[PDB]
Enzyme design. Structure first.
Site, PDB file in Angstrom:
ATOM      1  N   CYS B 108       5.552  -0.318   3.097  1.00  0.00           N
ATOM      2  CA  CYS B 108       6.116   0.445   1.974  1.00  0.00           C
ATOM      3  C   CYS B 108       7.519   1.017   2.224  1.00  0.00           C
ATOM      4  O   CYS B 108       7.707   1.885   3.078  1.00  0.00           O
ATOM      5  CB  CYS B 108       5.190   1.599   1.573  1.00  0.00           C
ATOM      6  SG  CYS B 108       5.789   2.438   0.051  1.00  0.00           S
ATOM      7  N   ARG B 111       8.539   5.165   1.119  1.00  0.00           N
ATOM      8  CA  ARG B 111       7.896   6.279   1.787  1.00  0.00           C
ATOM      9  C   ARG B 111       8.650   7.601   1.910  1.00  0.00           C
ATOM     10  O   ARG B 111       8.053   8.584   2.308  1.00  0.00           O
ATOM     11  CB  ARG B 111       7.389   5.839   3.162  1.00  0.00           C
ATOM     12  CG  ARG B 111       6.137   4.964   3.099  1.00  0.00           C
ATOM     13  CD  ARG B 111       5.684   4.572   4.510  1.00  0.00           C
ATOM     14  NE  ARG B 111       6.645   3.664   5.144  1.00  0.00           N
ATOM     15  CZ  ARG B 111       6.560   3.235   6.394  1.00  0.00           C
ATOM     16  NH1 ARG B 111       5.571   3.623   7.158  1.00  0.00           N
ATOM     17  NH2 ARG B 111       7.455   2.390   6.869  1.00  0.00           N
ATOM     18  N   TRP B 280       6.662   4.212  -8.700  1.00  0.00           N
ATOM     19  CA  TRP B 280       7.608   3.670  -9.684  1.00  0.00           C
ATOM     20  C   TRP B 280       8.226   2.415  -9.037  1.00  0.00           C
ATOM     21  O   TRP B 280       8.271   2.282  -7.808  1.00  0.00           O
ATOM     22  CB  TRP B 280       8.694   4.671 -10.106  1.00  0.00           C
ATOM     23  CG  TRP B 280       9.434   5.323  -9.007  1.00  0.00           C
ATOM     24  CD1 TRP B 280      10.465   4.803  -8.268  1.00  0.00           C
ATOM     25  CD2 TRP B 280       9.245   6.660  -8.554  1.00  0.00           C
ATOM     26  NE1 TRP B 280      10.937   5.754  -7.385  1.00  0.00           N
ATOM     27  CE2 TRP B 280      10.204   6.903  -7.538  1.00  0.00           C
ATOM     28  CE3 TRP B 280       8.356   7.686  -8.910  1.00  0.00           C
ATOM     29  CZ2 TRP B 280      10.296   8.136  -6.875  1.00  0.00           C
ATOM     30  CZ3 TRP B 280       8.448   8.914  -8.256  1.00  0.00           C
ATOM     31  CH2 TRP B 280       9.413   9.126  -7.247  1.00  0.00           C
ATOM     32  N   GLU B 285      10.938  -6.171  -7.480  1.00  0.00           N
ATOM     33  CA  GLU B 285       9.528  -6.538  -7.560  1.00  0.00           C
ATOM     34  C   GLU B 285       9.320  -7.358  -8.835  1.00  0.00           C
ATOM     35  O   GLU B 285       8.614  -8.377  -8.835  1.00  0.00           O
ATOM     36  CB  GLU B 285       8.637  -5.281  -7.582  1.00  0.00           C
ATOM     37  CG  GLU B 285       8.801  -4.362  -6.358  1.00  0.00           C
ATOM     38  CD  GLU B 285       7.892  -3.135  -6.408  1.00  0.00           C
ATOM     39  OE1 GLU B 285       6.658  -3.311  -6.351  1.00  0.00           O
ATOM     40  OE2 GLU B 285       8.411  -2.000  -6.510  1.00  0.00           O
TER      41      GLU B 285
HETATM   42  C1  HEM Z   1       7.642   6.128  -5.317  1.00  0.00           C
HETATM   43  C2  HEM Z   1       7.691   4.778  -5.558  1.00  0.00           C
HETATM   44  C3  HEM Z   1       7.423   3.780  -4.631  1.00  0.00           C
HETATM   45  C4  HEM Z   1       8.287   2.732  -4.362  1.00  0.00           C
HETATM   46  C5  HEM Z   1       9.736   2.581  -4.899  1.00  0.00           C
HETATM   47  C6  HEM Z   1       7.564   1.855  -3.454  1.00  0.00           C
HETATM   48  C7  HEM Z   1       7.943   0.528  -3.232  1.00  0.00           C
HETATM   49  C8  HEM Z   1       7.123  -0.437  -2.647  1.00  0.00           C
HETATM   50  C9  HEM Z   1       7.440  -1.858  -2.650  1.00  0.00           C
HETATM   51  C10 HEM Z   1       8.762  -2.528  -3.007  1.00  0.00           C
HETATM   52  C11 HEM Z   1       6.418  -2.432  -1.993  1.00  0.00           C
HETATM   53  C12 HEM Z   1       6.242  -3.932  -1.768  1.00  0.00           C
HETATM   54  C13 HEM Z   1       5.413  -4.455  -2.923  1.00  0.00           C
HETATM   55  C14 HEM Z   1       5.103  -5.942  -2.810  1.00  0.00           C
HETATM   56  O1  HEM Z   1       6.008  -6.727  -2.452  1.00  0.00           O
HETATM   57  O2  HEM Z   1       3.946  -6.333  -3.086  1.00  0.00           O
HETATM   58  C15 HEM Z   1       5.486  -1.400  -1.578  1.00  0.00           C
HETATM   59  C16 HEM Z   1       4.319  -1.639  -0.833  1.00  0.00           C
HETATM   60  C17 HEM Z   1       3.353  -0.691  -0.557  1.00  0.00           C
HETATM   61  N1  HEM Z   1       3.397   0.624  -1.001  1.00  0.00           N
HETATM   62 FE1  HEM Z   1       4.910   1.577  -1.848  1.00  0.00          FE
HETATM   63  N2  HEM Z   1       6.267   2.356  -3.123  1.00  0.00           N
HETATM   64  C18 HEM Z   1       6.200   3.569  -3.832  1.00  0.00           C
HETATM   65  C19 HEM Z   1       5.019   4.345  -3.902  1.00  0.00           C
HETATM   66  C20 HEM Z   1       3.845   4.088  -3.225  1.00  0.00           C
HETATM   67  C21 HEM Z   1       2.706   4.979  -3.263  1.00  0.00           C
HETATM   68  C22 HEM Z   1       2.623   6.300  -4.054  1.00  0.00           C
HETATM   69  C23 HEM Z   1       1.841   4.500  -2.328  1.00  0.00           C
HETATM   70  C24 HEM Z   1       0.610   5.046  -1.860  1.00  0.00           C
HETATM   71  C25 HEM Z   1       0.074   6.267  -2.186  1.00  0.00           C
HETATM   72  C26 HEM Z   1       2.432   3.292  -1.813  1.00  0.00           C
HETATM   73  C27 HEM Z   1       1.769   2.407  -0.923  1.00  0.00           C
HETATM   74  C28 HEM Z   1       2.222   1.138  -0.568  1.00  0.00           C
HETATM   75  C29 HEM Z   1       1.478   0.174   0.213  1.00  0.00           C
HETATM   76  C30 HEM Z   1       0.097   0.408   0.826  1.00  0.00           C
HETATM   77  C31 HEM Z   1       2.175  -0.976   0.222  1.00  0.00           C
HETATM   78  C32 HEM Z   1       1.764  -2.371   0.747  1.00  0.00           C
HETATM   79  C33 HEM Z   1       0.923  -3.107  -0.300  1.00  0.00           C
HETATM   80  C34 HEM Z   1       0.314  -4.399   0.227  1.00  0.00           C
HETATM   81  O3  HEM Z   1       0.110  -4.507   1.451  1.00  0.00           O
HETATM   82  O4  HEM Z   1       0.020  -5.306  -0.587  1.00  0.00           O
HETATM   83  N3  HEM Z   1       3.665   3.035  -2.345  1.00  0.00           N
HETATM   84  N4  HEM Z   1       5.887  -0.148  -2.013  1.00  0.00           N
HETATM   85  N1  LIG Z   2      -0.287  -5.097  -3.466  1.00  0.00           N
HETATM   86  C1  LIG Z   2       0.171  -6.485  -3.800  1.00  0.00           C
HETATM   87  C2  LIG Z   2       0.994  -6.451  -5.097  1.00  0.00           C
HETATM   88  N2  LIG Z   2       1.916  -5.285  -5.125  1.00  0.00           N
HETATM   89  C3  LIG Z   2       2.615  -4.996  -6.421  1.00  0.00           C
HETATM   90  C4  LIG Z   2       4.059  -5.593  -6.375  1.00  0.00           C
HETATM   91  N3  LIG Z   2       4.797  -4.803  -7.418  1.00  0.00           N
HETATM   92  C5  LIG Z   2       3.967  -3.605  -7.787  1.00  0.00           C
HETATM   93  C6  LIG Z   2       2.878  -3.499  -6.668  1.00  0.00           C
HETATM   94  C7  LIG Z   2       3.411  -2.778  -5.351  1.00  0.00           C
HETATM   95  C8  LIG Z   2       3.828  -1.316  -5.577  1.00  0.00           C
HETATM   96  C9  LIG Z   2       2.890  -0.210  -5.417  1.00  0.00           C
HETATM   97  C10 LIG Z   2       3.405   1.136  -5.666  1.00  0.00           C
HETATM   98  C11 LIG Z   2       4.792   1.341  -6.047  1.00  0.00           C
HETATM   99  C12 LIG Z   2       5.652   0.182  -6.174  1.00  0.00           C
HETATM  100  N4  LIG Z   2       6.937   0.307  -6.511  1.00  0.00           N
HETATM  101  N5  LIG Z   2       5.144  -1.068  -5.938  1.00  0.00           N
END
Ligand code: HEM
Ligand SMILES: NCCN[C@@H]1CNC[C@@H]1Cc1cccc(N)n1
Ligand code: HEM
Ligand SMILES: C[C@H](O)[C@H](O)[C@H]1CNc2nc(N)[nH]c(=O)c2N1
Ligand SMILES: C[C@H](O)[C@H](O)[C@H]1CNc2nc(N)[nH]c(=O)c2N1
Ligand SMILES: NCCN[C@@H]1CNC[C@@H]1Cc1cccc(N)n1
Ligand SMILES: [Zn+2]
Lengths: 407, 411
Positions: B108, B111, B280, B285
């Site tokens: 993520c 963070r 958000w 994405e």
């Molecule tokens: C505030 C806005 C946030 C932004 C801009 C952000 C952005 C991202 C992006 C770009 C990814 C990659 C998504 C993908 O390629 O599938 C990601 C992955 C992830 N985010 Fe964040 N995130 C945010 C909030 C959160 C929140 C609130 C949580 C948890 C409470 C979180 C947990 C995760 C996790 C666990 C992953 C990996 C997902 C996976 O392994 O498929 N994110 N995030």
């Molecule tokens: N977990 C596999 C697919 N992830 C999808 C890819 N786009 C939205 C979501 C990730 C995600 C979760 C929380 C915030 C964010 N910006 N993006």
């Protein structure tokens, strides 16, 4: 044991068994992955030679033959007596081609078997190295129709008589720190551009001065030489639409040629082994030209295009980046110099991977280095799972000479 | 042991000590790196140590390590485990846990926002209908008319493994996918299989290119049930370009709330199998992956045509050119409708500050480079040039098998 890699765009799965022959360490542990870190005796030697000879004999379908056994003993005797050994020309060619085949960070390995090897093991002086290098440059440049090559100088003996090419790449532009606190030319070569002066080079203080070779032979101090200007093919960069582009006054050399690595074959170490191929557009357009610590030209190009540089979200950097890379590919292609774009190169690598999986049981690859520095996910390698591991023969990193040389 | 990471663009070097608290495996060995591999019921025995490690971290975090409160709690949980084979977390511990699973999520990039997470405690929920209500409330709160707020809803933890709560949707909001008999696909190709399960379960599919899928919710191990999210609650954004008036006619739009619902939240050995979370979007994405992946909406060509780029040879970089324009269109559309979104330059720059901050105040920030670097313009974003260390810390978000592959239907 038998690992599998999946391509998430095509669902193709390949099984990997080649990694089971891996020898060297990766820097990772079951507790920590270091995948993104740039740089993670007679008794020692005979086992290495045996490993090598066995694979060599196997490749020529004579594994276990008398020749195989005969050679195996001959080298053994030589090591026991001389504490080292010499490779047969055939073993040298095979070793060099395989070190390229094993280079996990190279996207252009589909070309691996087509490599011209120049045996410079009879070299004894810096002038001789200069001679061998010019011949290499001219051969590979081939008037723009580039051909891959490597020149192999004498192997290490006692470490106190190492052959080394102090330059990082055979052809690169100089860099000087100006009073303005700013940097003139290529910032990455500031320290090298100085060591050339500390030695005698007469820097023309331009923005694109082809540096001088600093060759070290048999352990002595390095000497300077100016590659015959007529041998350094350069390309002026112009855009196929923005006539103002040329006014930027940009040009790049056509021969990509790494000269600071160490080639390891059957336990032997070749500290001076310059190699070259042909460029993938992004190396220059994205990294050399747009890297913040390099020619860092994004702002200038942006201004010239009259883009809203007020807010990052207008993506002016991205728009410019694309044009700067369309230009490079355009120029090179116009002047008839070999060059490949990231779309074509990555597609190739995927084909190569499949071949390597079905004919060798695997293909070591470093995803962090393989995926282009722009448009990552629109290239196939982005969706391709890869396994990274080290196989010999190999190209390894080695300390800059100026931090080890006892003058 | 100490470990250093260097930024090759600034020469800044950092030292990691946090990795010493890493327990889970990485998938790698001293012989093979699995860095680009996507996917590399407990017993009392193995549970108390997990509970103890967690409670120590919690009590330290609040500066009460070794206090009487701390010791009583450990004694309380211990007794509960020997007695019931499991244990319940206090509200404060759940919140702390959830925030930390996000803080430890090395894939993520957003963070820096980790401590600002609204946690919804849905552990008193017993049915799918109850799950639906909880999820609707989360969507309404998070959306907040376009001014998005991060949030997570946590349903009852696993017990014997036969009574799991699960959200079958991979994301709370996604568009349906439909495989046509001519082999082409209408809608989102990635959701074709889930859409079929929904249709089979009774969903009347409108069969368009942007149909919001219904929630399929499983409570207490029972067969999942379908629910339609109140349309008025689903915020969507029409995509148009600031200079290309024909872009709008491409007929594209996207939902505003990114929200993962198929991961498993582990806190102190306890397993929360249904824990939808949302934040958000980062522009790429949608702009790069959802629209331009060959196995998703795949709009590179059609956009390319309209712009009349030279599509004869790849070296014209027509694909790259259409990519930037589309991403420009996604950011512009969201900003115009006042729906929170962040571009990849801004997001990665913030992540680097977050990361440095974390090394100084925490001794590390596990990060997965392969996932952190944006899918376009990689090296002109600071993260590309940043060495990272990847290791697993708990509390954490984990993958779990798709429920349709494990569920015992009851009928
Ligand atoms: C505030 C806005 C946030 C932004 C801009 C952000 C952005 C991202 C992006 C770009 C990814 C990659 C998504 C993908 O390629 O599938 C990601 C992955 C992830 N985010 Fe964040 N995130 C945010 C909030 C959160 C929140 C609130 C949580 C948890 C409470 C979180 C947990 C995760 C996790 C666990 C992953 C990996 C997902 C996976 O392994 O498929 N994110 N995030
Ligand atoms: N977990 C596999 C697919 N992830 C999808 C890819 N786009 C939205 C979501 C990730 C995600 C979760 C929380 C915030 C964010 N910006 N993006
Ligand atoms: C013929 C065309 C070739 C293409 C298109 C190609 C392309 C690439 C690219 C794009 C890189 C990464 C460069 C960087 O980011 O610094 C690379 C690295 C590398 N290539 Fe190739 N290459 C070719 C030929 C060669 C040859 C002839 C050899 C060996 C004889 C070779 C050995 C390597 C090695 C070892 C690296 C990594 C160097 C490092 O770690 O800094 N390449 N190649
Ligand atoms: C820190 C990170 O490993 C570093 O910036 C890497 C990333 N990927 C790369 N990939 C290639 N081809 N070349 C490089 O120099 C790098 N630099
Ligand atoms: C095979 C490879 O690991 C895979 O395609 C990864 C690469 N990086 C990624 N990065 C993000 N953010 N999201 C992804 O889905 C992926 N896919
Ligand atoms: N070793 C790190 C620097 N490598 C530089 C980065 N650009 C040219 C050279 C790589 C290289 C070697 C051979 C062929 C090629 N296309 N590229
Ligand atoms: Zn690893």
């Amino acid at each position: 044991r038998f690992l599998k890699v999946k391509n998430w765009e095509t669902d193709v799965v390949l099984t990997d068994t080649l990694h089971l022959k891996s020898t060297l360490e990766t820097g990772c542990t079951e507790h920590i992955c270091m995948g993104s870190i740039m740089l993670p005796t007679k008794d020692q030697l005979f086992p290495l030679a045996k490993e090598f000879l066995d694979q060599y004999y196997s490749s020529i379908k004579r594994f276990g033959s008398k020749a195989h056994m005969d050679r195996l003993e001959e080298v053994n005797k030589e090591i026991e007596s001389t504490s080292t050994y010499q490779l047969k020309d055939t073993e040298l060619i095979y070793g060099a081609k395989h070190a390229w085949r094993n280079a996990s960070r190279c996207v252009g390995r589909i070309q691996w078997s087509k490599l011209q090897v120049f045996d410079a093991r009879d070299c004894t002086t810096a002038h001789g190295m200069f001679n061998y290098i010019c011949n290499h440059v001219k051969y590979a440049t081939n008037k723009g129709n580039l051909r891959s090559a490597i020149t192999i100088f004498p192997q290490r003996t006692d470490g106190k008589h190492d052959f080394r090419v102090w330059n990082s790449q055979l052809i690169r532009y100089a860099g000087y720190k100006q009073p303005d606190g700013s940097t003139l030319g290529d910032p990455a070569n500031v320290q090298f551009t100085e060591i050339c002066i500390q030695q005698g080079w007469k820097a023309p203080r331009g923005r694109f001065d082809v540096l001088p070779l600093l060759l070290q032979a048999n352990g002595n101090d390095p000497e300077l030489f100016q590659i015959p200007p007529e041998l350094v093919l350069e390309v002026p960069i112009r855009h196929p639409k923005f006539d103002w582009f040329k006014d930027l006054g940009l040009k790049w050399y056509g021969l990509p040629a790494v000269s600071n690595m160490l080639l390891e074959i059957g336990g032997l170490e070749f500290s001076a082994c310059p190699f070259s191929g042909w460029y993938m557009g992004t190396e220059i357009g994205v990294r050399d030209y747009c890297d913040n610590s390099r020619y860092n030209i994004l702002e200038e190009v942006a201004k010239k295009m009259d883009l809203d540089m007020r807010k990052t979200s207008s993506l002016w950097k991205d728009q410019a980046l694309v044009e700067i890379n369309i230009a490079v590919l355009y120029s090179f292609q116009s002047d008839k110099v070999t060059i490949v774009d990231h779309h074509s190169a990555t597609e190739s690598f995927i084909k190569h991977m499949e071949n390597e999986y079905r004919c060798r049981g695997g293909c070591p690859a470093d995803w962090v280095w393989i995926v282009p520095p722009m448009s990552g996910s629109i290239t196939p390698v982005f969706h391709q799972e890869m396994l990274n591991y080290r196989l010999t023969p190999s190209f390894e990193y080695q300390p800059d000479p100026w931090n080890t040389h006892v003058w």
